[PDB]
Amino acid sequence: MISKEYHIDEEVGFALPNPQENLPDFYNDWMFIAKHLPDLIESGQLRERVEKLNMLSIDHLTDHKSQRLARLVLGCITMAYVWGKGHGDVRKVLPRNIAVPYCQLSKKLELPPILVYADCVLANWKKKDPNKPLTYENMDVLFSFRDGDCSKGFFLVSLLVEIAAASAIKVIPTVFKAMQMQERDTLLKALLEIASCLEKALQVFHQIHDHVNPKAFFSVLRIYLSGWKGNPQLSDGLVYEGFWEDPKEFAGGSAGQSSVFQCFDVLLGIQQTAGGGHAAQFLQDMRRYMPPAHRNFLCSLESNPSVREFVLSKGDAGLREAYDACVKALVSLRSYHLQIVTKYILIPASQQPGGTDLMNFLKTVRSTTEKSLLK
Ligand SMILES: C[C@H](C(=O)Nc1ccc(F)cc1)[C@]12C[C@](NC(=O)c3cccc(Cl)c3)(C1)C2
C-alpha cells in the first residue's frame, strides 16, 4: 500500500480520481469561457472575453479538486488566448485579470503557470455513467480547444494508459518489501506482474489510432499544447501581467510530464536522468511540471535501494528473466510511441506546404532501456 501523501489512486494511479466538473458560482465567468473555447476561438471572441474579465480571487477554491479544475480551466483559457485560432498570430502578454490568479493558484499547487499533462489528461475527464467501467465509450473530457481537434481521443487514450499502468504502480511496494525481506519468490512474482500490466498498457495505447487523426493532431491539437520555452514565436517567453514584470519561459505539454513515463525506469534502475545528455535533462526538468506529490513519489523511488542491483547480485536466471520482462515491456512502449510520433507528427509535417526533436528524445530513452537488459 502506497502512502496517501503521494496522491496515487489504487484504481486510476496518477490520474485525479473523479475530477470536479463545476467550480463555485463565483467562477462562472471563467467557466463559461473554458466550456465555449471551440465557438469563442473560431468567432474571434475568445481574447476580448478574457480581457473583459475582472480579477477574481483564488480564495474561494477551497479544496484540491476545485484548485485542479481551476488550473485546467485557466490553463486551457491561457493556451486559447496565447495561440488564438492556432494560425501563428500570437499574444505575448497574458492580461493581469487572468494572469495573477493563475500564477497564484499555480504557486499554491507548486506547478508552473502553463497547461501541463496533469491538467489536460489527469484532471480533464469524467465517466458518462458512473456505474459503468473506465472505458473509452463510457468516458469524456471536460475541455477541448477546437471542434475536430481530437482532444477527446488524445487525452482519454493517454488517461487510459495511465489507468492501465495503475495496476503495476500498486505492485511497487511489494517489490521493495520483497527485497528488504529477502523474498526471492515474492519479488519474481511482483516483477512478472509489473511486466504483465505494462504489456496491458501497450495494448491500451493501440486505441489512439481509432480516435485521433494525423492532420487534426498535427495542425490543431499540437499547436494548443505548445508552450513558450525555446519557441521562436515567443522567444523571450510570456509576460504574466501583474505577477512578473519580465517574460517567463515554460515548456508545453509533453509525455515526459507523465509520472508513469518516468516511474518504471526509476523503479528498474534504468538511469534515464544520468549521463548528462538532452534526454536526461528534459526528464528531470519535467518533474517540476508534475504535481508535487508525484514529484515526491519519484524522489522516494530514487531513494530506495536498487532493484537492478539486487537482481544482478543474486546469480539467479529466473529473477533476471522477470526483470528483463519489465525492461522489454518498456522498450515496446517506447517503440510504439515512436511509431505514433511518425504517423501523427513526422508525416503530417512533411505534407505541410516538426517531430524530429521528440523522435530523437524517444530514441535515446528507448536505447537506454534496451541497454538495461541483463540477459
Ligand atoms: C501519446 C501519449 C501522449 O504523448 N500524451 C500526451 C502528451 C502531452 C500532453 F500535453 C497530453 C497528452 C502518451 C505517451 C504515453 N505513455 C507512455 O508512453 C508510457 C511510457 C512508459 C510507461 C507507460 Cl505505462 C506509458 C501515452 C502518454
From Swiss-Prot:
Its cofactor is heme b. PANTHER family: INDOLEAMINE 2,3-DIOXYGENASE, INDOLEAMINE 2,3-DIOXYGENASE 1. It catalyses: D-tryptophan + O2 = N-formyl-D-kynurenine; L-tryptophan + O2 = N-formyl-L-kynurenine. One of its GO terms (molecular function) is tryptophan 2,3-dioxygenase activity. Monomer. Keywords: Cytoplasm, Dioxygenase, Heme, Immunity, Iron, Metal-binding, Oxidoreductase, Tryptophan catabolism. Belongs to the indoleamine 2,3-dioxygenase family. Catalyzes the first and rate limiting step of the catabolism of the essential amino acid tryptophan along the kynurenine pathway. Involved in the peripheral immune tolerance, contributing to maintain homeostasis by preventing autoimmunity or immunopathology that would result from uncontrolled and overreacting immune responses. Tryptophan shortage inhibits T lymphocytes division and accumulation of tryptophan catabolites induces T-cell apoptosis and differentiation of regulatory T-cells. Acts as a suppressor of anti-tumor immunity. One of its GO terms (biological process) is swimming behavior. Its EC number is 1.13.11.52. It is an enzyme of class 1 (oxidoreductase). GO terms for cellular component: cytoplasm; cytosol; smooth muscle contractile fiber; stereocilium bundle. Induction: By IFNG/IFN-gamma in most cells. Exogenous inflammatory stimuli induce the expression of IDO1 in antigen-presenting cells such as dendritic cells, macrophages and B-cells. Expressed in mature dendritic cells located in lymphoid organs (including lymph nodes, spleen, tonsils, Peyers's patches, the gut lamina propria, and the thymic medulla), in some epithelial cells of the female genital tract, as well as in endothelial cells of term placenta and in lung parenchyma. Weakly or not expressed in most normal tissues, but mostly inducible in most tissues. Expressed in more than 50% of tumors, either by tumoral, stromal, or endothelial cells (expression in tumor is associated with a worse clinical outcome). Not overexpressed in tumor-draining lymph nodes. This is Indoleamine 2,3-dioxygenase 1. Activity is inhibited by and MTH-trp (methylthiohydantoin-DL-tryptophan), modestly inhibited by L-1MT (1-methyl-L-tryptophan) but not D-1MT (1-methyl-D-tryptophan). It comes from Homo sapiens (Human). It is found in: Cytoplasm, Cytosol.
